[PDB]
Structures are given as C-alpha cells and as structure tokens.
C-alpha cells in the first residue's frame, strides 16, 4: 500500500502515498504491463463533484468548514435539478492547474502553478472561438518570451453540443500526398489537411503551410479560420558552425499548443481546452525532424556533413541527430524564443518530483514519455524509478471529432 | 482474449495470445504501473504442477504431446518428486529449458539468437575448484579468440536452500572498484562492495583502474573461495577513435565477454542459483552506461574537454556530442580487433524482426520497453516506436539477492 521509488544514480529513495488517491485505471494488470501502449448521469456525477470539492476545500485549508458544506449542498441541488453544475472561477483555475500537475506524461510540470487560465465558458460561436484562440496565441507567444496558458471553452452537456478544436495543435504544418508517392510537408497531418481542403481551404501546397483552425461550437458543423499570420511566430533553423544548414530550408513554430485533449474537472468534461507552454528542443529536433514518419531529414543532413553512411556502426545517424538538435536550440535562443534543452528540463523534473514527494506524497510519472528521445541515460530521469497512476482533474485523450461528428 | 500492439512508425499491428500462458505477477495493478521499477525451498504440492506445465511445454515442442514417452516421463517425475522431494531434468530438457529462459527474457534485446546457445551441463560439480574449472572452460569457449559464441554453464540446482551453488561475482569478468579515503573511486564504482569482499577474503588488489576481479565461488552451501581467471583467457580491447588520435591516451579498455553470473534460472520449478551466461556486447552497454553513467567511469567531461566543446552551457549539447564520439570509438575498437560487437541500430532492427516472427509463430514476445530501448538515440531506433507487452513466462531468469546478504558463514 506504501510504495518506494529509487534513483539508481543517487541512491535517493522516495515513498509514494499519493497513488492510493488514484481512481482511474492504468490498463495494466497483475499479469501484464501495458506501460508502453500509447492509448491503453446524475448518479455518476455527484461523487465526482464531491471528490473534487473535497480536494479544493482542503487545498485552501477550509475542509469541513461551513463554506465547504454549503458549496457541496449547492452543487448537489444543482445536479439534482439541472443534470449538471457550473464551477466557480476559483474552482476552474484550481482544476486546470491540477490537471497539469497530474499529467504523468509531462516533463515540464515544475511550472504547474504558473498557468494563465482564460475562461471562455461564455463562448457560443466558432467566430468567438477564433477570437479567444488568437488572444491565447498572442498572450502565450508574448514576442518570444513564452507564457503558459490554457483557454477553456464550455463544458459538454448532452454530448450533441460539443465544443471542439478539430486541430491537434493550434499551430501545425499541412501534409500533402503527392503524385510522386512521397509526402510534402508534415505526414502527421495528411488526414486533417484533407478535411480542411474538403471544407474549402485553399492550400498553398508547400512544405511548411500553417494549417487553418477548424472550430466546432455547440455541436455545430466546424468552420475554417486562418490564424493571423503576424501572430504565428516561426524560427528559421540554422547551425552555429555549419554554414550550409540554413539551405535545408527548415523552420519551426515557437508555440506548442495541444488542442485535441479533454479536460476533466469534478466530473465535468471540457472537450475544447487548448493549452500551451514552450518547447523542449528534442520535440522538434529529434521527433518532428527525424522520425521516419515525420520530416525524416537525417539522410539529407548526414549527406551534407559527408559522413560514412555505408554502415550503421559508424553512428552517422547519431552524429547528424546531435547536430540537428544543436541547430534547433541555437536558432530559438538566437531569435530570443523560449526553449528548454533536455538536460535542463529533466534536471528540473527531478527537482519537481522531489518537491511533490515532499509536499504531496508523490508524483505520477510515465517513464516511457518522460525520458527524452535522445541521450536517455545521460539525463537524470533515466535513472529515476517512477510510478504511473491516474489522478483527477486530468487531461485525457478523446476520439478525433471527424470519426464522431454527425454532419 | 486477444491483445494488439501497434508500431507507430510503420502502422504494423500485431496480436498477442501468448500472454494467456503467463502465470507469474508483474508488479502492476489496474491502478498503478510499475513498469519503470528495476526490482518490483519449494513444497511437493507446488512442485508437481510446475514440472507438469514444463514437461507439457517440452513434449509439445518436440511434437510428442500425449505420447507414451510423454506420459511415462510425467509418471517418472511424479514418482521422483513424491519419493525424493525433487527431480532431475534430462539433458534434453535442460537444454530446452535454458534456451527458453533466454527466449522469455523480456529485458533482452539479443533474443533473435535464442536458439543458438551452447549449454554446458555442470550438474556433476561438487566443489569451488570444480566450478572454477567449468567457468574457465566456458570463458575460453565463449571467447573463441574474439568470434564470440553464446553459452551458459548450469551448476547443481537448489535442494534445501542450505547447499546452494553461487557465483558471488555479478559477471564472470568485471573490473575492481576502490573507494579512496578522499571519497573518490579508482576503477569501476559498481563493484566497490564486491571488491571489498574479495580483499577481505584474501585477494591482493593491484589497485589500478582496470583490475580484473577474482572469481568468488560457492559450492554446495560452503563458504566461497577465491580464484584468479588465467589472464590469457581474458580478452580485452584497448579503446581508440578512428579520427581522434588523442582518444587512446585516455587509457581506456574494456573486456570482450559480457557474462552475467548472478541470476537464477527457473526450469519446471527447479532453481539453478548458479547459471552464468554470456553473449556479446551491444556497444551502448560499454560506451553509454559503463563509461558515461555518473555512477560508473563517468568519462564525459574528460572526453568533451579534449574535443574542445563549449562546456559553459548544457544547450551546446556537449554531453551528447562527446557521447556519440565515445560510442564510435567503442564500435571501431572492437571491430578493428575482430571482437564480436553489435551496434544499437543493428541490434534493435534485428529485435523487431525477431519480435514480429515470434508473434507469427509463437503468438507473442514479452518485452520490457524500458530496457529494450537503447540508452542513447532512442527514437532513431525502431524499438522506440514499437508498443510492447511485458509479462512473465517460465522457464525464466530471475533476480536473486546478493549472496553476502544471506550466506550462513561456516568459518
Ligand atoms: C511550460 C512548458 C512545458 C514544457 C517544457 C512541457 C513539456 C512537455 C513535453 C516535452 C511533453 C511530451 C510531448 C510529446 O512527446 O509529444 C509534454 C506532454 C504533455 N504536457 Fe507538457 N510541458 C509544458 C507545459 C504544459 C502545460 C502548460 C500543460 C497543460 C496546461 C501541459 C500538459 C501536458 C500534457 C497533458 C502532455 C501529454 C500530451 C500527450 O499525451 O500527447 N504541459 N510536456
Ligand atoms: C548474443 C548476444 C546478446 C546480446 C547482444 C544481448 C543484449 C542484451 C542487452 C543489451 C541487455 C541489457 C543489459 C543491461 O542493460 O545491463 C540484455 C539483458 C539480458 N539478456 Fe541478453 N543479450 C545477448 C545474449 C544473451 C544470452 C546468451 C542470455 C542468456 C542465455 C541473455 C539473457 C539476458 C537476460 C536474462 C537479461 C536481463 C539482465 C538483467 O535484468 O540485468 N542474453 N541482453
Ligand atoms: C510505443 C511508444 O509508447 C511510443 O513510441 C512513445 C514512447 N515514448 C514517447 N515519449 C514522448 N515524450 N512522446 C512520444 O510520442 C512517445 N512515444
Ligand atoms: C529506473 C529505470 O528503470 C532504470 O534506470 C533502467 C532503465 N532502463 C534500463 N535499460 C537497460 N537496458 N539497462 C538498465 O540498467 C536500465 N535501467
Ligand atoms: C505542451 N507543450 O508545451 C509542449 N512542449 N509539447 C506538447 C507537444 C508538442 C509536440 N511534441 C511537437 O513536437 O510539436
Ligand atoms: C547478456 N549479455 O550478452 C550482454 N550483452 N549484456 C549483459 C549485461 C552486460 C552489462 N550491461 C555491461 O555493460 O557489462
Ligand atoms: Zn504496467
């Protein structure tokens, strides 16, 4: 019932008691571990509302107070009467911050208490959604001095009036299947790009075309909007030592803004809740650029470095990987756009884990996601045992809206 | 029940049915995943089902399930258990058991090779001197002048738990570690505790950076005895770099034969507490972990200093740059000396091919992602993108406590 986690580099041992508060299921059983799998009514709602309100009133040191009991009765009366309830602004902000705090896949959680919460629960149309999103992009970007933010659209009601951002992130690049057989742009975004074109987007058919927003308000058919170009901060990628790197024609955007997840607070479901922080360098340099199914640039870079690509044991892929990641970090830093390297971020996470174990009794963490995708063992998280479990409030995956929407 | 795993790079989906034959527990529950935790005398009653399960597996593998030979063997083992409290495996069953323990080892990336394993049966061994001779023969066979051959040596099984055979070394060949009065370490810090034990037992330590440890061998529950492996049998490789001529003056070398000697082999409920096994290295084991872990030889700074990298801020990725060069040097050095080694790209590519084959022919391949993904360049290897299912099949290799923690000293 009490669990220990050890760091095998420092011998530091921490005791986890927070897992006992966990409610949701992991997908593992005593017989099988699914740790590497990517995607493993009124009666329902009151216990969830109560669980949340209890944690909230405990957090402001007013547990069992008159104000606690009164809010519990108020919400109970509201669920019994309306089949749902509304969060106070204080509860919404607490809930959003804790959904981030609880995000076991996120290495950036030392930042969790510093989150700007934009309450968009008064939004009614897709044009309104576009306005809120531009404002979030502008605030979060802050001319390169990035600030963490979330924008929260109205909660699910009966499930036929869902707010959704159809985009997987606020800013991403289009992908196009060519007659050639190859893919132009970002292959990750081929299906969604097709949906936009189908809905009438005039695609430029280039390598780095910022996708338009496809926004769905109140369960209505989604609508297209272009983010003002002047609000999308991009960074041309160059190398501090290699003059030729700039001629690859690479760029990336500064603001990573996940827009397809569902925020659950006190049993309420916020299906449109785009949130943004800043990039860890490996996200762009390792995954976005070097995944075989992404921009897949290792070959081109290695050829420009004149490495021996005849044999895997020359480690040519590894050498070009490091250089690409050096160029990503250098380019963002030179343009004064916030970015964190994987050494700095993982060091910060270990400190955050220690803080959470000390002050909260634990920190749910998914090692498979937390360890960076290059140089794993030279970062301290590789040597850190972690326990993964699901706490609420939470960010959850949800099915893509085009599979589910009724046109 | 069927379980699917997807490869997110190729979209290949595989279906696992083998997990149904799993009996042992993982450490995980419906409420918690323990997938990153390093470490999460039998009765007659518990023994016969284990033996039966194993013999059924063995006779099925040889296409003799339900034959008179199968039935007679079950009867013979049942009689032997009821009579003597235990039983003896036939040579064929021992070979099959050892190969399958390897096949089932979810943390092993090298399993494409599982059916090619030389099994040395040492169950007639009675003394530590006998163990030493067996171990020297294993080392010489496995080394094969650099053309490494996988092998296992299997000493007598556990009886009452008071007469265990144990190799006290964690690997047959490893370097000594010495804690200095000023708090620094000479040699390999991983082996400081064991080095102190050896010195206590009478070893005269050279006190250098790469001293091959003596073997410390326990036969039949007796106190362990020290033996020096003949130096001519210990193949080592001086580490140099193909471009950087200063690399050799770091004074680095490593041994060619990785030979894990502290695990327990379980076959049909029998426990083989001394079962050293060896293959060949994947380069990252040495170049990433052994050389660059902060708690091991910790060479990153010295290498980066010699490369004249910008070390003022982590975001120059100086550690990452030095790491790749060290790993190039290790692969270069072994290949140049004609000592078998595999790079992490080749090894992971082969593992994926093995895994897909296992799914098709066996219905699954238990695999621990946390261990299978290499400790550098994770996502440019195919295993990073491969969903895996981790579960425990028997026969198996298991951890056991260090023998100095449990040994009853006779004097
Ligand atoms: C402040 C800077 C932040 C950094 C450096 C950071 C870092 C990261 C990284 C590197 C990942 C893995 C992403 C991937 O591999 O695709 C991640 C995942 C995640 N982060 Fe953060 N994060 C930050 C802010 C935030 C914020 C503000 C939130 C929510 C308010 C958040 C919630 C999450 C969630 C829910 C995931 C899992 C996403 C998924 O499963 O695809 N993070 N974080
Ligand atoms: C033939 C070449 C082989 C290669 C390249 C290979 C590769 C590896 C690697 C890289 C690891 C991780 C080791 C670590 O991080 O400390 C490992 C683990 C392991 N391998 Fe292999 N292996 C090979 C042969 C064998 C053989 C012959 C056996 C047994 C018969 C075996 C059984 C195991 C086991 C039980 C582990 C888990 C070790 C632990 O938990 O500490 N492997 N393998
Ligand atoms: C199959 C495996 O779960 C998958 O490739 C994971 C591994 N770790 C990851 N880690 C992060 N941070 N992001 C990812 O997309 C992934 N992908
Ligand atoms: C805490 C974590 O489980 C631990 O550091 C693991 C991670 N993955 C590993 N993978 C391999 N192959 N070998 C190891 O020693 C480790 N160590
Ligand atoms: C949440 N956020 O701040 C962040 N750093 N990453 C979210 C995911 C971004 C994605 N991995 C990408 O490379 O675009
Ligand atoms: C099993 N074997 O062949 C192997 N490749 N590795 C076993 C463990 C070796 C260990 N990682 C080391 O670096 O010495
Ligand atoms: Zn698990």
Describe the structure.
The PDB classes it as oxidoreductase. The entry lists the keywords oxidoreductase, nitric oxide synthase, substrate analog. The structure is a homodimer. Chain A has eleven helices and 18 strands. Chain A has 407 residues and is an alpha+beta fold. The longest helix of chain A has 19 residues, at 316-334. In chain A, β8 and β9 (223-225) form a beta hairpin. The first copy, chain A, has helices at residues 42-59, 66-82, 89-101, 126-141, 190-198, 281-290, 298-304, 316-334, 342-360, 367-370, 401-404, and strands at residues 3-6, 13-16, 116-119, 149-152, 164-165, 175-177, 183-185, 213-216, 223-225, 234-236, 251-253, 257-258, 262-265, 268-270, 275-276, 279-280, 339-340, 394-396. In chain A, the strands form seven sheets. In chain A, strands 3-4-15-12 form a four-stranded mixed β-sheet, with helices on both faces. Chain A has a three-stranded antiparallel β-sheet with strand order 5-8-9, with helices on one face. A three-stranded antiparallel β-sheet of chain A has the order 14-13-18. Chain A is 33% helix and 14% strand. Chain A is globular and about 70 Å long. In chain A, α7 (298-304) crosses α8. Chain A folds into three domains: 16-121 and 148-158 and 262-276 and 346-370, Alpha-Beta Complex (Nitric Oxide Synthase, Chain A, domain 1); 122-147 and 162-233 and 397-401, Nitric Oxide Synthase,Heme Domain,Chain A domain 2 (Nitric Oxide Synthase,Heme Domain, Chain A, domain 2); 234-256 and 279-344, Nitric Oxide Synthase, Chain A, domain 3 (Bovine Endothelial Nitric Oxide Synthase Heme Domain, Chain: A,domain 3, Alpha-Beta Complex). At the A-B interface, β1, α6 and α8 of A face β1, α6 and α8 of B. Bound molecules: protoporphyrin IX containing FE (2 copies), 5,6,7,8-tetrahydrobiopterin (2 copies), N~5~-(N-hydroxy-N-methylcarbamimidoyl)-L-ornithine (3KJ) (2 copies) and zinc ion. Zinc ion sits between chains A (28, 33-35) and B (28, 33-35).
